[PDB]
Amino acid sequence: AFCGSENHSAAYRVDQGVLNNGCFVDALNVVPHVFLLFITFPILFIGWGSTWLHFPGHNLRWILTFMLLFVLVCEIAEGILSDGVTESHHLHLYMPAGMAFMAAVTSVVYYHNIETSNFPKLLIALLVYWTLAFITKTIKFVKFLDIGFSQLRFCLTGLLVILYGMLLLVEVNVIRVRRYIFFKTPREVKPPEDLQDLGVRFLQPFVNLLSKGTYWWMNAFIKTAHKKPIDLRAIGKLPIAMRALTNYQRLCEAFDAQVGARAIWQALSHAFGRRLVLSSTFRILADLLGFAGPLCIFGIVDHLGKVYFVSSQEFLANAYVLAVLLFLALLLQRTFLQASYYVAIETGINLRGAIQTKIYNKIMHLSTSNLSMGEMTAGQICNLVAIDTNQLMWFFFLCPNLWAMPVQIIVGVILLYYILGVSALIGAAVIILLAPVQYFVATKLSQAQRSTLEYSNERLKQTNEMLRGIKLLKLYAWENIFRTRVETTRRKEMTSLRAFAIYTSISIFMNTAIPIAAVLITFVGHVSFFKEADFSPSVAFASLSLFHILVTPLFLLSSVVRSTVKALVSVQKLSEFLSSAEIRDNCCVQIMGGYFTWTPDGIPTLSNITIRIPRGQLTMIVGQVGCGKSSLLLAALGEMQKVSGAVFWSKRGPVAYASQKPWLLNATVEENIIFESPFNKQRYKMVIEACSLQPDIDILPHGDQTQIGERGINLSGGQRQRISVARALYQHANVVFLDDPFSALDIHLSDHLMQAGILELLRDDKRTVVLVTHKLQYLPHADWIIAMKDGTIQREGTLKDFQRSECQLFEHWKTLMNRQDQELEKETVPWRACAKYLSSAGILLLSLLVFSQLLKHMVLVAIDYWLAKWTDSALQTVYAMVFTVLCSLGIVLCLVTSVTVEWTGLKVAKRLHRSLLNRIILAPMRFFETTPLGSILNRFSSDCNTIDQHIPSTLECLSRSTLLCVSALAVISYVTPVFLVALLPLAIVCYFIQKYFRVASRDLQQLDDTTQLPLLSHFAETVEGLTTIRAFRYEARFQQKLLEYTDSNNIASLFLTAANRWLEVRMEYIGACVVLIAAVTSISNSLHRELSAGLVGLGLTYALMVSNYLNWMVRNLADMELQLGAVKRIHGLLKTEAESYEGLLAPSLIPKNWPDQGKIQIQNLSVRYDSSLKPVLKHVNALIAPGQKIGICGRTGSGKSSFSLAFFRMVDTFEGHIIIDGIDIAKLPLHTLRSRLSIILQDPVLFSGTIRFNLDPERKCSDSTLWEALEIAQLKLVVKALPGGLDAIITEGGENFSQGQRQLFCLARAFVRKTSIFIMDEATASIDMATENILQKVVMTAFADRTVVTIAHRVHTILSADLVIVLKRGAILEFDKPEKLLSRKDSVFASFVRADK
């Protein structure tokens, strides 16, 4: 009944005034709301009962609408509470506020449906609705001036006046800007820069404020992952402010706006400063809203111990009112927290997208003398993209936590002083004792985290250069030596990881033990000294919850201080890399007087080279090894540092460079032959037909579209060089720089690539060809022969200019191809990985881990179940004598948990890298050939980085959070068992989100992985072929190709971020509902039944614990499920094969001098590479004398290298005997066989280190035998002219020297062994003819008694052999003396030596 039912004839009657009545204004302020409702719901019926742009004042109108909803929800509560004093139900108290609550939601729904459709004239209803109701609240505010500031409804209607007037001022802030009524200029603003037309599906900035906090736009994206899975071009593009190009520009303006390692920090606080400020303000607001939970736990438990308006003191002294106020505080704190998290993470993603483009822009100007001679490697650069940029991004996720922790500590100490008293100071300085100690171990971490990222980096050198040369380590039996070399660095890294793990264990122990020591010294330091300071369950379970909420930042301070040390050395390495070295009449190039140098401080490698290159004519650069050929090619491009002289051109213009070491993309065969050029089919066919690449293309599995490169099918040695040559013949570049292309090709391919190609594709089409070559038989075909000697050019000009003026190098050319009886002239033309993590820990450590974390939280509950038996006894010192022995059992059961977590996380990571390193070495070469090296290196680089450094923290956070959430649901179901009835229809709802989330999580997790991999692959392939890219002038195109990758990675990271925040805000809303339920069923159980009021505070404290640690349990469970995939991949690699190193023969029967007379008898041998392939050799029979010098010649693909590898059992021999010295070769251990036979591969496989290390990694032979085995490799004068002499530094891959001196260094490496069987698999390929003719005469005199099997590149060097093998497609075609083979004149050997004269 309205206006009461007591029948006093005073509220129904209006005599002295119809407006002066105490009632009837409650009857008057409803018809504005029913006016709005009954004219708004027709518009919802006729308009919406069947490229969006926000109106201005959007965030202010939504914030004022939420404040209006909160004040109306308080006014309904004031009406219901003020009715309870009366005898009956006075309807005029709760109905006029309830109708306004029903109409305000309708008003904000109406405003959103108007703004999303751009119907601004339809706001005229909202023009008037915020006037008259405001007017109807104004009279109700001024007729209440009879009751001021001591009655609650006075302040409530004053707030209603202020909110309605503010909404009216925002409403008139729409007509005056987007004019719809009473104006002549309808200033229609544009849609948001057409960001809905470009195909952006992110929609997070272009959403209303309710969908920005609850991520409601994401709720449609989870529902459509169940039907069709999420792919790229379904998450759309990026918005115009989150692109890497526009995030890179604001990084550059910050760098230019200030003209070191602090310049980046001032450049990151200027570009991305206000966004971190905004996220820190969201974190601060969530902190201040978190400091209203314990105030409600104070007020509720303080209530349980003890004119129709209700005073404002007796409103905040109610219990259900404080419960719903705590619920509405948690509901807004939990969304301010996610609003902080999203802004911080999107700022980190924009930072990553900016600094990756800055690193690439440094790469495109990077001098290659940094990579080659000295400082950095390619793996170091791809590490500072993959690891260092990710660490700097992960710092930006926690920088608002670092900025908003001390304000939480300060407000907690002030509120603790207000609640408990000066005894809070007893619990304050102890927390202040946590301030330098968490700094102190920080300094210790700044040692250890600066050491591990040193040592592991060196390990990622020594692993990688092992794997990329693993075949040579499996051919010299050096694999155990290199495995011990990596194990030493791994041991020195595990020492630093122990020193880091001990200090982060004591940091975790400090962060978890300083709160409980504070609780102990505060609660016993209260009842001992100040026994009259009002000890009560209210103040006890308020200050205990404040101590708990001062331990929620300490849940993350250890991870914050762990992550801010890895991001200072990150920006230190980034500043070290960004300020490194950089580059700056019918003739193409006309160098004159130019001294060029590789090292900036040293002798110039080229000296006074005054050359000229004719246009459209083939010019040849010939000379010895180390003579300046590739350096002269790289001085015209500008890669070498110019000291003096001039370099003219035609700016340069693009050339077609094909380097001495071929460089392949991670793309198909077609896509790195055309190389970002227009595809012309006829020119492509003429290119691959002149290169004779078509029969090698047909054997490939997909033909023209098979993914070759590093992360794909491993090609041969000549196929990749022919592809890299074929790239250069497809450019219209008009000047071709063909560095030595005949290294891996044989005679029949080289004579076809020289006739068609260099003489027919580039001499018909008048393109300048500059051909570095060692094949002097093509010296007739040149128009300008350049001849170098020790860097300086010796002579240039035609063959007439060389036979008339030089006449000594000319005769030296003529006696090199034995053409003395001729003339040189120009031609007139859970999972199992979790058990693997738990079985590699050991049962003694695992039972000490499980049964000491269930024992800590069974103690921590008894620490909080006591003080509920104590403070109920406060309404006597034996309660405090057993509280110290429980608080000391929460420290000594904390230290053991924090040490066994890190002990487990270290003992697993030691056991999981040694067991992987010992198994990768034992794997057969077929495993290294098929599977890409990028995967095997990523299991050593990233997964062995997340196992030791991320899982022992994630496991600790997961175990602590899930045990707090389990032990917190077991005591709010003990004090209120009715909560169990309310647990079942909600907790399974948690399951019914998580399953419903997971098919959109595990989908979107696989776009943050399969889009980061091409980004890292592009960063790896832009460094290996940097000189090739900068010579084609494809720097801008490759920068655009970077931007198109990092944008697609950034959008896939942003969608995963938004999905995570969607799930987390839903889980925290369920947690807030848990707090509301467990507060209501504790209050209503203590007011009716007798819950003794301490159990109510206990249940309230642990309900707040559920709200805090439900989301951390969910997040750490998802993070453990993500990080266990690394253990799964390592366990996948750990179950690989073995090469069967044991032999069928006991080592007592193999003599000490095993191949004492190399007497290799081969009978019916046939090899294969894998059991599904054709036999490479077939029925080969050969008998070799104990001192013969057999040579092997044949075409490419005949099986020459398979014959060479058949002695070392690197090919699957399935039929046939190889018997040496009467002892079979299959019944032999592999480390006995391979360490007593030598082989020189065609490719140089030099490792980084020193000359003495590369010649022998064991340091077993003397120093003088490293010189006799260097004098015969034609390198004594080169090594003796080095600064170090011996022990001079060879850098990674051997790039410090040439590709001729590299092959000479591998030849000298094989000559230090005193074995009696030698195999030379085309060793003299990169070496010139003069040095080869010297080297053969020194080798076949010093090794005058050793059996040498020489796979001959140029078959004119093999005529001095005793016997000659001619392979032709498998089986041996000819096997006789070379004179008897040449006497036939129709034999294949006489055919082979005919094409080389």
732 closest CA partner among 688, 699, 694, 765: 765
Phi and psi at residue 1261, to the nearest 5°: -95, 165
Per CB under 6 A, 630 contacts ligand ATP? yes
Out of 594, 626, 717, 741, the residue judged to bind ligand ATP by CB under 6 A: 626
Q: Does 1199 bind ligand ADP (CB under 6 A)?
A: yes
Q: Which is nearer to Mg ion, 526 or 629 (CB)?
A: 629
Nearest distance from C-beta of residue 638 to ligand ATP, angstroms: 14
Cβ 585 to ligand ADP shortest distance, Å? 46
| Encoded tokens for 856 | 């800590």
d(CA 216, CA 205): 12
* Nearer to ligand ADP (CB atom), residue 132 or residue 713: 713
CA angle centred on 82, ends 78 and 84, rounded to 5°: 125
How far apart (Å, rounded) are the C-alpha atoms in residues 537 and 864? 12
Cα torsion angle, 947, 951, 952, 953, sign: positive
Rounded Cα gap, residues 196 and 967, in angstroms: 48
Please give the helix or strand (H or E) that residue 429 lies within, else none.
helix 429-432
- Are 1376 and 1384 in contact by the 8 Å Cβ rule? The answer is no
> For 892, how many CA atoms within 13 A lie in the half-sphere containing its CB?
6
Which of Mg ion, ligand ATP, ligand ADP, none sits in contact with 1198, Cβ below 5 to 8 A by type?
A: ligand ADP
457 binds Mg ion (CB under 5 A): no
**CA gap 818, 843 in Å, rounded:** 76
Q: How far is the CB of 1176 from ligand ADP (least distance, A)?
A: 4
Q: Which of ligand ADP, ligand ATP, Mg ion, none has residue 1243 at its interface (CB below 5 to 8 Å by kind)?
A: none
- H/E element holding 1096? helix 1094-1109
Q: Which does 204 bind (CB under 5 to 8 A by kind): ligand ATP, Mg ion, ligand ADP, none?
A: none
Of residues 141, 138, 68, the one with CA closest to residue 101:
68
Nearer CB in complex with ligand ADP: 826/926: 926
Q: Near ligand ATP by CB under 6 A, which window of 308-316, 502-510, 579-587, 623-631?
A: 623-631
* Dist CA 336 CA 213 (whole Å): 8
Which residue positions form the known binding site? 598, 626, 630-631, 660, 1196-1197, 1199-1202, 1298
DSSP collapsed to 3 states, 823-872? CCCCCCCCCHHHHHHHHCCCHHHHHHHHCCCHHHHHHHHHHHHCCCCCHH
What number of chain residues touch Mg ion (CB under 5 A)? 5
Token pair 């951390």: residue: 1112
Q: Three-state secondary structure along 1147-1170?
A: CCCCCCCCCCCCCCEEEEEECCCC
Helix pair angle (1035-1087, 244-256), 10° resolution: 100
Q: Is 1196 in the site for ligand ADP (CB under 6 A)?
A: yes
Which among ligand ADP, Mg ion, ligand ATP, none contacts residue 1196 (Cβ within 5 to 8 A by kind)?
ligand ADP
Instruction: Decide if 334 contacts 1068 (C-beta within 8 A).
Output: yes
Residues 1194-1233: x where in contact with Mg ion by CB under 5 A, - otherwise, as a string: ------xx--------------------------------
Residue 870 contacts ligand ATP per CB under 6 A:
no
Residue 1295 binding: pick among ligand ATP, Mg ion, ligand ADP, none (C-beta 5-8 Å cut-off by kind) = ligand ATP
Residue 640 sits in the site that holds ligand ATP (CB under 6 A) = no
Closest to 123 measured CA to CA, from 67, 61, 64, 79: 61
Q: Pattern of binders to ligand ATP over 1323-1352, x per CB under 6 A?
A: ---x--------------------------
Considering CB distances under 5 to 8 angstroms, the limit depending on partner class, which of Mg ion, ligand ATP, ligand ADP, none binds residue 126? none
Is residue 632 within 8 Å of 611, Cβ to Cβ?
yes
Q: Does 1028 bind Mg ion (CB under 5 A)?
A: no
Name the DSSP class of 582.
B
Which residue's entry shows tokens 């750490």? 1116
Site string for ligand ADP, 1155-1174 (x = CB under 6 A): --------------x-----
863 alpha carbon, distance to own chain's centre:
43
Q: Which helix (H) or strand (E) holds 772?
A: strand 768-772
Cα separation of the two ends of the chain: 120
Which of the listed partners (ligand ATP, Mg ion, ligand ADP, none) does 372 bind, with a CB threshold of 5 to 8 Å by partner kind?
Answer: ligand ATP
Residue 773 binding Mg ion, by CB under 5 A:
no
**Residue with smaller CB distance to Mg ion, 339 or 772:** 772
CB of 1201 to ligand ADP, least distance (A): 4
Two structure tokens written together for 663 = 């460089």
Site string for ligand ATP, 1260-1299 (x = CB under 6 A): -----------------------------------xxxxx
The listed partner (ligand ADP, Mg ion, ligand ATP, none) that binds 275, CB under 5 to 8 Å by sort, is none
1202: partner contacted, choices ligand ADP, Mg ion, ligand ATP, none (Cβ within 5-8 A by kind)? ligand ADP
Separation of alpha carbons 1186 and 1316, rounded Å: 9
Distance CA(1139)–CA(1101), nearest Å, equals 62
Residue 579 phi/psi, 5-degree rounding, is: -110, 35
Give the rounded distance of the alpha carbon of 509 from its chain centre: 30
- Strands 594-597, 641-642: pairing kind: antiparallel
Binding residues for ADP: 1196-1197, 1199-1202
Supply 414's token pair. 């002030």
Q: Is 1200 near ligand ADP (CB under 6 A)?
A: yes
Which pair of tokens denotes residue 110?
A: 């109406």
Binding-site positions for ATP read 598, 626, 630-631, 1298
| Closest CB 1301 distance from ligand ATP, rounded Å | 6
CB of 1251 to ligand ATP, least distance (A): 12
> What dihedral angle (degrees, nearest 10) is formed by the CA atoms of 769, 775, 778, 782?
40
Among 373, 568, 978, 1382, binds ligand ATP (CB under 6 A): 373
Q: Does residue 1198 interact with ligand ADP by CB under 6 A?
A: yes
Site map (CB under 6 A) of ligand ADP, residues 911-950, x = contact: ------------------x---------------------
How many residues bind ligand ATP (CB under 6 A)? The answer is 21
Contact residue for Mg ion among 350, 391, 456, 630 (CB under 5 A): 630
Q: How far is the CB of 1241 from Mg ion (least distance, A)?
A: 8
Dihedral-angle region of residue 193 (phi above 0 means left; psi in -120 to 50 means alpha; beta otherwise): left
Tell whether residue 743 is a contact of ligand ADP (CB under 6 A).
no
Report the residue closest to ligand ATP, judged by CB. 1300
Query: One-letter amino acid identity for 668?
Result: T
Q: Which does 628 bind (CB under 5 to 8 A by kind): ligand ADP, Mg ion, ligand ATP, none?
A: ligand ATP
Residues that bind Mg ion (CB under 5 A): 629-630, 660, 1200-1201
Residues that bind ligand ADP (CB under 6 A): 929, 1169, 1176, 1196-1202
Residues that bind ligand ATP (CB under 6 A): 369, 372-373, 598, 605, 625-631, 660, 740, 1295-1300, 1326
